[PDB]
Structure 1
Amino acid sequence: TQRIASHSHVKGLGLDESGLAKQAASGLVGQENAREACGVIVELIKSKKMAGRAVLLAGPPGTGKTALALAIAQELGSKVPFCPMVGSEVYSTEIKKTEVLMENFRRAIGLRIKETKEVYEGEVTELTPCETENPMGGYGKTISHVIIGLKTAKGTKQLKLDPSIFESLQKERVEAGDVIYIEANSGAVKRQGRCDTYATEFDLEAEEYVPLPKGDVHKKKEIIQDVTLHDLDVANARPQGGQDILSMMGQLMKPKKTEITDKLRGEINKVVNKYIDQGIAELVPGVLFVDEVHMLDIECFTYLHRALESSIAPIVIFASNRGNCVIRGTEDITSPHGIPLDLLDRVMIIRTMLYTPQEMKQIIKIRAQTEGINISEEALNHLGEIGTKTTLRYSVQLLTPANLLAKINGKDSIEKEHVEEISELFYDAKSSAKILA
Structure 2
Amino acid sequence: TQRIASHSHVKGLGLDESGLAKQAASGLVGQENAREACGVIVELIKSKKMAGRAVLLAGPPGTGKTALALAIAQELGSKVPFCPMVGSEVYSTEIKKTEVLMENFRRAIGLRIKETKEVYEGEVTELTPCETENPMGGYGKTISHVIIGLKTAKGTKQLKLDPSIFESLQKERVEAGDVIYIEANSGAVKRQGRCDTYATEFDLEAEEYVPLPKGDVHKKKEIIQDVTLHDLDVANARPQGGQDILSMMGQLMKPKKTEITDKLRGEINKVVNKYIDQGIAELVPGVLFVDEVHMLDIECFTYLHRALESSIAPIVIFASNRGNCVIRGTEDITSPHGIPLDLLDRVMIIRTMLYTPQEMKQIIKIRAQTEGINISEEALNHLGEIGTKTTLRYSVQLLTPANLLAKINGKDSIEKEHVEEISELFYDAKSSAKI
Shift of 1:342: 1.3
CA-to-partner distance for each residue in 1:279-325, whole Å, 9 max, x for gaps? 11101100111111111111111111110100110000111121211
8 A Cα contact 2:63 2:355, kept in partner: no
CA-to-partner distance for each residue in 1:50-100, whole Å, 9 max, x for gaps? 111111011111251011000001111111111101111111100111111
1:308 maps to 308
CA distance in 1, matches of 2:324, 2:247: 52
* Root-mean-square deviation (Å): 1.8
CA-to-partner distance for each residue in 1:124-153, whole Å, 9 max, x for gaps? 123123321353454422222222222111
CA-to-partner distance for each residue in 1:333-376, whole Å, 9 max, x for gaps? 11111111111112211101112211111111111111111111
Shift of 1:223: 2.1
Structure 1 gap segments, 5+ residues each = none
CA distance in 2, matches of 1:353, 1:207: 63
Q: Kindly tell me: are residues 91 and 133 of structure 1, through their superposed partners in 2, closer, same or farther at Cα, counting changes over 3 Å?
A: closer
Range moving further from structure 2, 224-233 or 236-245:
236-245
Shift of 1:38: 0.7
CA distance in 2, matches of 1:55, 1:258: 28
2:179 maps to 179
Q: Kindly tell me: are residues 144 and 323 of structure 1, through their superposed partners in 2, closer, same or farther at Cα, counting changes over 3 Å?
A: closer
Shift of 1:269: 0.6
CA distance in 2, matches of 1:186, 1:44: 43
CA-to-partner distance for each residue in 1:174-230, whole Å, 9 max, x for gaps? 111111111122211121212221113545445631221221111132221110011
2:375 maps to 375
Range moving further from structure 2, 234-243 or 356-365:
234-243
8 A Cα contact 1:51 1:311, kept in partner: yes
TM-score (normalizing by structure 1)? 0.95
1:398 maps to 398
CA-to-partner distance for each residue in 1:8-34, whole Å, 9 max, x for gaps? 112221110010112212212211111
1:7 maps to 7
Q: Kindly tell me: are residues 425 and 206 of structure 1, through their superposed partners in 2, closer, same or farther at Cα, counting changes over 3 Å?
A: closer
CA distance in 2, matches of 1:286, 1:204: 51
Shift of 1:255: 4.1
Q: Kindly tell me: are residues 249 and 149 of structure 1, through their superposed partners in 2, closer, same or farther at Cα, counting changes over 3 Å?
A: farther
Range moving further from structure 2, 148-157 or 49-58:
148-157
Q: Kindly tell me: are residues 429 and 159 of structure 1, through their superposed partners in 2, closer, same or farther at Cα, counting changes over 3 Å?
A: closer
Shift of 1:388: 1.8
2:427 maps to 427
Range moving further from structure 2, 394-403 or 201-210:
201-210
CA-to-partner distance for each residue in 1:380-402, whole Å, 9 max, x for gaps? 22222211211101111111111
State, as a whole percentage, how many aligned pairs show the same letter.
100
3-state secondary structure, aligned to 1:114: strand
CA distance in 2, matches of 1:167, 1:352: 71
Q: Kindly tell me: are residues 249 and 224 of structure 1, through their superposed partners in 2, closer, same or farther at Cα, counting changes over 3 Å?
A: farther
Q: Kindly tell me: are residues 272 and 161 of structure 1, through their superposed partners in 2, closer, same or farther at Cα, counting changes over 3 Å?
A: same
CA distance in 2, matches of 1:250, 1:177: 47
Range moving further from structure 2, 330-339 or 199-208:
199-208
CA distance in 2, matches of 1:60, 1:27: 21
CA distance in 1, matches of 2:133, 2:4: 80
Matched residues, number: 435
Shift of 1:429: 2.7
Q: Kindly tell me: are residues 4 and 143 of structure 1, through their superposed partners in 2, closer, same or farther at Cα, counting changes over 3 Å?
A: closer
CA distance in 2, matches of 1:318, 1:207: 51
8 A Cα contact 1:53 1:315, kept in partner: yes
2:66 maps to 66
1:317 maps to 317
CA distance in 2, matches of 1:218, 1:157: 9
CA distance in 2, matches of 1:407, 1:23: 32
3-state secondary structure, aligned to 1:250: coil
Range moving further from structure 2, 131-140 or 65-74:
131-140
8 A Cα contact 1:63 1:321, kept in partner: no
3-state secondary structure, aligned to 1:75: helix
Q: Kindly tell me: are residues 137 and 350 of structure 1, through their superposed partners in 2, closer, same or farther at Cα, counting changes over 3 Å?
A: closer
CA distance in 1, matches of 2:248, 2:402: 58
8 A Cα contact 1:241 1:247, kept in partner: no
CA distance in 2, matches of 1:246, 1:416: 66
8 A Cα contact 1:195 1:210, kept in partner: yes
8 A Cα contact 1:130 1:147, kept in partner: no
Q: Kindly tell me: are residues 287 and 121 of structure 1, through their superposed partners in 2, closer, same or farther at Cα, counting changes over 3 Å?
A: same
Q: Kindly tell me: are residues 380 and 207 of structure 1, through their superposed partners in 2, closer, same or farther at Cα, counting changes over 3 Å?
A: closer
Q: Kindly tell me: are residues 215 and 376 of structure 1, through their superposed partners in 2, closer, same or farther at Cα, counting changes over 3 Å?
A: same
Q: Kindly tell me: are residues 148 and 105 of structure 1, through their superposed partners in 2, closer, same or farther at Cα, counting changes over 3 Å?
A: same
CA distance in 2, matches of 1:206, 1:272: 41
CA distance in 2, matches of 1:244, 1:298: 42
Q: Kindly tell me: are residues 201 and 252 of structure 1, through their superposed partners in 2, closer, same or farther at Cα, counting changes over 3 Å?
A: closer
8 A Cα contact 1:135 1:142, kept in partner: no
3-state secondary structure, aligned to 2:111: strand
CA-to-partner distance for each residue in 1:391-434, whole Å, 9 max, x for gaps? 10111111111111111110111222212211111222332112
Q: Kindly tell me: are residues 264 and 130 of structure 1, through their superposed partners in 2, closer, same or farther at Cα, counting changes over 3 Å?
A: farther
8 A Cα contact 2:398 2:419, kept in partner: yes
Shift of 1:246: 6.1
3-state secondary structure, aligned to 2:143: strand
3-state secondary structure, aligned to 1:252: coil
User: Where in structure 1 do 4 or more consecutive aligned residues deviate above 6 Å?
Assistant: none
Q: Kindly tell me: are residues 245 and 419 of structure 1, through their superposed partners in 2, closer, same or farther at Cα, counting changes over 3 Å?
A: closer
Shift of 1:251: 4.1
8 A Cα contact 2:327 2:339, kept in partner: yes
Structure 2 gap segments, 5+ residues each = none
8 A Cα contact 2:63 2:353, kept in partner: no
Q: Kindly tell me: are residues 241 and 150 of structure 1, through their superposed partners in 2, closer, same or farther at Cα, counting changes over 3 Å?
A: same
CA distance in 1, matches of 2:208, 2:293: 56
8 A Cα contact 1:59 1:353, kept in partner: yes
